Design a binder for these strands. Structure first.
Ligand code: SF4
Ligand SMILES: [Zn+2]
Ligand SMILES: [Zn+2]
Ligand SMILES: [Zn+2]
Lengths: 677, 380
DNA sequence: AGCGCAATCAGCTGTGACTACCT
DNA sequence: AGGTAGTCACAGCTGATTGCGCTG
């Protein structure tokens, strides 16, 4: 229906609008009228996207001049496809409610592997070689030699798109990635090239974070698209981590071995301009000098260039030219493929980063390995320390950057973690006919001994027995699915080993099946599949995993999957490896951020992010427990999102295992009754 | 706007006076209006039914030892099951009840599918002192129920009731295939949970057409069982659904006559103690076998022995009595004596039957429509 | 051994009835 | 010989002190 905002009417596919959605629309309209950025926090993954798109379309219709381009950067490809299909549903609703079409174009962007039609590159699973093969098949030299019609195998989609697809536009009709591929294959055009041509003449477009956070591709994909545009980062609770990883590179023995292997081939090709031919040869030994040095750590972000200009005595000026040399010398050398060549490009990227970015970074060398620390492994990584650098080139190029996710409880730390000027300070807590979640914090066990996962008490037998008892008698009350997140893989395996040693793991087995998530991707996928198939029937299952793992955020536990989420201790990141402590010191001496406050913020952010995936949809319900007394302290509860705070009553903040089980039983019994709409 | 934010209601404005004392007439009207508070139907719901072959599955796992329902789940479940069996046999004359107990990943057929209530109640009382161990197996119980009910006639409604206390079930094979087979066999499955909602039970109930519910307390448990007592609606006419059953007259033997022949009861012959060798009882009309309890299907010739009054008690639903035409006393130019109670007609309204055009007062009309279910005049 | 949340004491007040002193 | 303000018991609140815990 038509929702009447204070100064506009907006069509919405769903007749009924929840108060949270209405308040969200009010706040977003206020921000758009304020011409400023903002941060938002909503508890529903679904229903936020439709409201966002509806308000965006209404604002564009009312003010075509104020807003011209929309960006909906998300985390992965499933989010892209679901937002595209939701936009398609919205457009279908608008067509069926209005009767006339509109000249609005919406496309989804992804990598070369996602959008390609050649059968010679699809079967392979090399993401770093598909771009190189695509460049080799079609490039400037390919276009130049196509005039003579050279008899050689090459891609021909571009050779038809440049002569037929650069004239006919697509004013109307939003196209999904599969639709783009179908159009490209029926018209003999490359989907990527037609997307590149049609982004200029487009209304909305969605892609991943890496196309804006990484400077090496943001300029190519967004240079003069729109001076005044709206960008939104949905599910951006970990925006700082990806921003840090944007300017983070790693070096090891394999990388330098590959570089020394391929430099001989490069020299052989060259001997068949001179400013870099001799420049590239002696760069390897400077970094291999650290390989032979048996030292713990060396830190010198400003003095790294000074040290480089002593052993080899090279000026700082030529370092910045690597970026412009990459696009020039390589295309003249006619590289056959990017295989066995990416480390050379990453070395140039590292050199450019250290030459240009040296104010808020640090160089760390880590000669440590898991289970084999000191054999041969000096690991050099240019770890980023400030999250503002990856977010600067978007705040100054846009007007209403919005950070929204399901876990953004502290709105006073994000504006200081990254340079930001919020004007919203807005949070929304969902309301339903009944409370769909039962958050509670379990402290001491039945023996009145705290189950805190403190480092000095990790090896304690009493706390391990209490954790096992909690998981056992909890598994008898919540049916068809329990998700348990541990602090780390080492703690998880040490706890399950102790459970196996005692006669307690058998009692858990006879209630629900035990599934352990490991680092292997195929093993994790098959374990998830069998966990789902066990949850489908009445057998029940337990999913044991780690809070900081690829399975914590890779999947969503929709209703009847994972009715209970258990947090075994506060998930604290490893303070070792001398990487976290550098960031802690940088935030201490730069943003005046307390180290304890930042650690608690990260721990609670991860805990809330991994515990809020059990509530997807109004009808969905789930049980949330926190098996640590440290959660009971106010400084950690206050970091939980507002949609969980009001449901966490003061009655259950330190209750034992038995009373937690009783509360879970009452909640589950009272949540099985029919409800209304 | 709001209903209560407008004008305050004045309910006392109904009464009025014209001759200073008509309040007696008003209260007489109020007293007359107080009567006729029913719709002239004791049930007003389903007026018919169908032969139900219901199987009741009871969980026998360790979860039945939980003290959610005092004293434990098993005792309350069995007491409410005895009540349910009694009420179900009261409201279903030719129905049958089977009881299955699942324990240690296996299902035991506690009682055969039959219409004797006493046998089921005795079996439940015996099972009160069972041992709760292991885990339930929905697959085995459903397989046993399907195997028993596959050969039953199509016209009978085949139903399974599952009392699932434990939240975990062990299936030796895939259960969704069994659910598809049950759906193809048109077997209705209903589940009453005790702890919380289980996905497999919801899927089973939705696919087989049954209902899945979760107990809040003992009163809610009894309400759910009482709802399950009611028969389902029956189609107009499917096929030649009939059944050969006898009506054994309760012929007792008196020694005053020379035909006083004592006989042992077949039902009592299976008891450990001395069977009741009473003078008489219910003799089978086909093979002259002697039985004491009814309705019990004959063991020898297979004839179903039912009691005619039990079948006849539901005949008033087939032929309900049409409501009498309400007529004011002044407009009725006839006799002023009620045909049922011979009392003088002094009420403002007189009810006249549409068939015989007789005179009935308010009380007699209510009695005829509610209890008698027949017009006394139409009988003559 | 510096912060910060939480346990703890002081001061005032409500509710109810019991009790000492004197016009 | 009669009646009202202290007074005790038991509870509440808010306003500070002040004392134990605080990261793999
Ligand atoms: S130009 Fe397009 S179709 Fe051809 S190889 Fe590259 S991505 Fe694939
Ligand atoms: Zn017989
Ligand atoms: Zn009468
Ligand atoms: Zn009549």
């Amino acid at each position: 229906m038509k929702l009447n905002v204070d100064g506009l009417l907006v069509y919405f596919p769903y007749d009924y609008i929840y108060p949270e959605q209405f308040s969200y629309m009010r706040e977003l309209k206020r921000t758009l009228d304020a011409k400023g950025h903002g941060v938002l926090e909503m508890p529903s993954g679904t229903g936020k996207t439709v409201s966002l798109l509806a308000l965006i379309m209404a604002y564009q219709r009312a003010y075509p001049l104020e807003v011209t381009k929309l960006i909906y950067c998300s985390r992965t490809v499933p989010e892209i496809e679901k937002v595209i299909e939701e936009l398609r549903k919205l457009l279908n609703f608008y067509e069926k409610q209005e009767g006339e079409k509109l000249p609005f174009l919406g496309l989804a962007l992804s990598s070369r592997k996602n959008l390609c039609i050649h059968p010679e590159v699809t079967p392979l699973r090399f993401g770093k070689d598909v771009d190189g093969k695509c460049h080799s098949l079609t490039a400037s030299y390919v276009r130049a030699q196509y005039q003579h019609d050279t008899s050689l195998p090459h891609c021909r989609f571009y050779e038809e798109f440049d002569a037929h697809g650069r004239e006919v536009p697509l004013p109307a009709g939003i196209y999904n990635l599969d639709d783009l591929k179908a159009l490209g294959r029926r018209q003999g055009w490359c989907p990527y090239f037609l997307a590149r041509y049609s982004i200029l003449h487009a209304n909305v477009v969605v892609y991943s974070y890496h196309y804006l956070l990484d400077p090496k591709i943001a300029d190519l994909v967004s240079k003069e698209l729109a001076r005044k545009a709206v960008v939104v980062f949905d599910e951006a609770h970990n925006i700082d981590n990806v921003c840090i990883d944007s300017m983070s590179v790693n070096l090891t023995r394999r990388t330098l071995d590959r570089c020394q292997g391929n430099l001989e081939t490069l020299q052989k090709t060259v001997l068949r301009a001179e400013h870099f031919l001799g420049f590239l040869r002696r760069l390897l030994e400077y970094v291999k000098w650290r390989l032979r040095v048996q030292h713990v750590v060396q830190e010198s972000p400003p003095a790294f260039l000074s040290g480089l200009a002593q052993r080899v005595c090279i000026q700082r000026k030529p370092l910045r030219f690597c970026a412009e040399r990459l696009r020039s010398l390589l295309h003249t050398l006619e590289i056959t493929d990017l295989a066995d060549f990416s480390p050379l490009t990453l070395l140039a990227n590292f050199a450019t980063l250290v030459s240009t970015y040296a104010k808020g970074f640090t160089i760390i060398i880590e000669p440590f390995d898991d289970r084999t620390p000191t054999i041969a492994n000096p690991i050099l990584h240019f770890s980023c320390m400030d999250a503002s650098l990856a977010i600067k080139p978007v705040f100054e190029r846009f007007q209403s950057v919005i950070i929204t996710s399901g876990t953004l409880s502290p709105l006073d730390i994000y504006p200081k973690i990254l340079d930001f000027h919020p004007v919203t300070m807005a949070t929304f807590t969902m309301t339903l006919a009944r409370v769909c979640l039962c958050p509670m914090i379990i402290g001491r066990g039945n023996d009145q001994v705290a189950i805190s996962s403190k480092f000095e008490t990790r090896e304690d037998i009493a706390v391990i027995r209490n954790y096992g008892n909690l998981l056992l008698e909890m598994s008898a009350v919540v049916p068809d699915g329990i998700v348990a997140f541990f602090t780390s893989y080492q703690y998880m395996e040490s706890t399950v080993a102790s459970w196996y040693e005692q006669g307690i793991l058998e009692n858990i087995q006879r209630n629900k099946l035990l599934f352990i998530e490991t680092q292997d991707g195929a093993e994790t996928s098959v374990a998830l599949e069998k966990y789902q198939e066990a949850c489908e029937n009445g057998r029940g299952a337990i999913l044991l995993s780690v809070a900081r793992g690829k399975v914590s955020e890779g999947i969503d536990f929709v209703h009847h999957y994972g009715r209970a989420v258990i947090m075994f201790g506060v998930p604290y990141v490893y303070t070792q490896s001398r990487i976290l402590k550098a960031r802690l010191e940088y935030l201490r001496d730069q943003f005046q951020i307390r180290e304890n406050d930042f650690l608690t913020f990260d721990a609670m952010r991860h805990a809330a992010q991994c515990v809020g995936r059990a509530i997807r949809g109004k009808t969905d319900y789930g049980l949330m427990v926190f098996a640590d007394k440290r959660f009971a302290r106010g400084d950690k509860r206050g970091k939980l999102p507002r949609w969980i705070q009001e449901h966490l009553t003061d009655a259950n903040l330190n209750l034992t295992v038995d009373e937690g089980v009783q509360v879970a039983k009452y909640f589950l019994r009272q949540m099985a009754q029919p409800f209304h709409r | 706007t709001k209903r209560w934010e407008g004008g305050y209601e004045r309910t006392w404005e109904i009464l009025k006076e014209d001759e200073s004392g008509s309040l007696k007439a008003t209260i007489e009207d109020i007293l007359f209006k107080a009567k006729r508070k029913r719709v002239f139907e004791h049930h007003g719901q389903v007026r018919l039914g169908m032969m139900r072959h219901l199987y009741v599955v009871v969980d026998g796992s360790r979860t039945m030892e939980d003290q959610d329902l005092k004293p434990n789940r098993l005792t309350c479940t069995l007491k409410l099951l005895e009540y349910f069996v009694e009420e179900y046999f009261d409201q279903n004359p030719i129905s049958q009840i089977g009881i299955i107990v699942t324990k240690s990943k296996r299902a035991e057929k506690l009682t055969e599918l039959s219409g004797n209530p006493r046998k089921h109640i005795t079996s439940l009382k015996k099972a009160v002192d069972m041992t709760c161990h292991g885990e339930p197996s929905l697959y085995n119980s459903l397989s046993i129920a399907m195997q028993t009910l596959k050969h039953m006639p199509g016209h009978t409604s085949r139903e399974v009731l599952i009392i699932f206390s434990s939240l975990t079930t062990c299936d030796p094979s895939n259960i969704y295939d069994l659910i598809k087979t049950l759906k193809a066999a048109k077997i209705r499955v209903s589940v009453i949970g005790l702890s919380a909602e289980v996905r497999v039970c919801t899927v089973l109930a939705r696919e087989t057409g049954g209902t899945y519910h979760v107990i809040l307390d003992e009163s809610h448990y009894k309400e759910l069982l009482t709802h399950h007592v009611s028969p389902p609606p029956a189609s107009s006419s499917s096929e030649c659904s009939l059944i050969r059953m006898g009506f054994p007259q309760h012929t007792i033997a008196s020694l005053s006559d020379q035909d006083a022949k004592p006989s042992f009861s077949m039902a009592h012959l299976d008891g450990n103690t001395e069977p009741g060798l009473t003078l008489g009882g219910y003799f089978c009309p086909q093979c002259r076998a002697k039985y004491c309890e009814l309705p019990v299907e004959c063991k020898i010739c297979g004839l179903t022995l039912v009691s005619a009054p039990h079948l006849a008690r539901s005949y008033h639903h087939l032929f309900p009595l049409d409501a009498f035409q309400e007529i004011p006393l002044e407009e009725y130019n006839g006799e002023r004596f009620c045909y049922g109670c011979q009392g003088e007609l002094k009420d403002q309204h007189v009810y006249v039957c549409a068939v015989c055009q007789n005179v009935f007062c308010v009380d007699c009309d209510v009695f005829v429509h509610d209890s008698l279910h027949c017009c006394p005049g139409c009988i003559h």
